[PDB]
Amino acid sequence: MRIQHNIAALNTHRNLAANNAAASKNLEKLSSGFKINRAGDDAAGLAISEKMRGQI
Amino acid sequence: SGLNMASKNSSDAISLIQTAEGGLNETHAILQRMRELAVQSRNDTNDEATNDRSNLNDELKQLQEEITRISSQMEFNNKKLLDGSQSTNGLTFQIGANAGQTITMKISTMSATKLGVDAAKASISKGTAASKAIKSIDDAINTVSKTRSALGAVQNRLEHTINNL
Amino acid sequence: LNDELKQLQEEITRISSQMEFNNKKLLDGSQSTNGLTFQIGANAGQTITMKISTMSATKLGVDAAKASISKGTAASKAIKSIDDAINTVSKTRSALGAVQNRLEHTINNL
Amino acid sequence: SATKLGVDAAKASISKGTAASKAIKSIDDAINTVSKTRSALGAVQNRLEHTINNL
Amino acid sequence: SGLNMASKNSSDAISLIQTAEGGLNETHAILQRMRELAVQSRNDTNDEATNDRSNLNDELKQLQEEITRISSQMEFNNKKLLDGSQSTNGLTFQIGANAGQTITMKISTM
Amino acid sequence: GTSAENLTAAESRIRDTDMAAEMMAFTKNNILTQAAQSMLAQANQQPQGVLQLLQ
């Protein structure tokens, strides 16, 4: 309730970690120049891109 | 304590999955290169006599050794992933404090023999063999795309799991 | 995309039947039969009853047996099915938040 | 070397008109062989590039 | 989310349509060439004996093989367009967030 | 050539990213990170009730 646990700081830490992760993802997308670097980014579209690259 | 440790374990699983996906990206790349080589070999401007296609076959054989090498030299914490070790039973991640709160996962063998692109069935010595090699390479590209999708789905699931935890 | 969808359906079921407070499953249908009773008063009978519905994929008509996206046609129904599910879970969240806001005033009065 | 490729002076002189006939074919064979070797090297180079990316 | 994805889908449809139009531009071109060949063949200066018109027929047959080739070797994402595949039911584009906000399209055999 | 250009455009629109949107998102996320940092610095100082005990 008072000392042993400070829940506001925990919530703030969570949100801070999430924001840092999102900024890192954006940095990856900007440095790479591609919007899809992993399949977790977009599954339907990775396959399409690979087939289109083969066709090109 | 269980929930925090499960968050840690989920992050570890995400790291493993990222390793496997990064392994398969180069498989995609060299498969594209192999398809380009086959489409070039397929034309009749090239002569078997003066060794025009045997150089593209040199290139193709080296890329096949590399596609096998990436398969059976990939590891996370001394654990071979893309060989068929996990295709028998599967990797189990504890994503919960209590017992039974698990998820099972499986990764298939991604060598040249399994995908029908090894040199015993995908040579480009001839003009005829390149015809089959093109289709064989397309099938392999589609299969490895499918596997990458299967990995990314579990990654995206684990993210939501971490948030909930 | 169906791989992705199936994994998300396993997760929506997992959150339902792996949620607990003090070894008490909440989002399964355990409390939908009789309900949780909170004593918010010194004397007997000064209680409030509460109920939480089953929030699995089967109850909301979004499980894989009725929400595949293998075809183009099935995605048409899946969109509407997902909208209905979102509205239902919003309704349930509202029902919970109302009781929370009530309990705050109750604490002040106590 | 020239000895291995059959183009050394002991077998590829052009003193005569006849010897140049054989010298032309000998030089063609040597060009093809060294092209083959260059291809063999370039393949390993291209492999090592992908290896570096994966690493 | 639905509106942004519908924008993406509409752009994809535009790409497909551009592919088909680019395919038909060369059909126009070789049809013009074939008409020129026929108008030249039509005159009586040319002899069937010494193979004057059979060479224009060689040219014409090759251009007919090309007009068929463009038809049944055109594709977008492994989807034959100018064969009659879509002339039976048609391609449906989702250009809206909700269900039913679609447009159907059809392409004939060329 | 026409087909290659069209498919290249399609693949670019599918996979490549727009620099402006990602720049926007990155700036937004940095600002949010700074805000959360300041909020945490405040929240760590919030529990100071030592003046109850001593004097």
Numbering used by the authors:
A (entry chain A): 1 to 56
B (entry chain L): 57 to 221
C (entry chain Q): 112 to 221
D (entry chain G): 167 to 221
E (entry chain F): 57 to 166
F (entry chain A): 222 to 276
Article passage:
The flagellar filament is composed of the protein flagellin that assembles into linear protofilaments.
We analyzed wild-type, mostly curved flagellar filaments projecting from motile Kurthia bacteria by transmission cryo-electron microscopy. Helical reconstruction resulted in a map with a maximum resolution of 2.6 Å or better of the most ordered parts and an overall resolution of 2.8 Å (EMD-10362). A comparison of the 3D structure of flagellin from Kurthia (276 amino acids) and the published structures of L- and R-conformations of B. subtilis (304 amino acids) show that all share the same overall fold, including five helices and two β-hairpins, but that the loops before and after the β-hairpins were shorter in Kurthia. This suggested that flagellin was essentially present in a single conformation, in which the 11 protofilaments were tilted slightly left by ~ 0.06°. Our data indicate that wild-type Kurthia flagellin was present in just one single conformation, and formed nearly parallel protofilaments, irrespective of flagellar curvature. This suggests that in Kurthia, the polymorphic switching of the flagellar supercoil from left- to right-handed and vice versa, as induced by reversal of the flagellar motor, might not require a conformational change of the flagellin monomers.
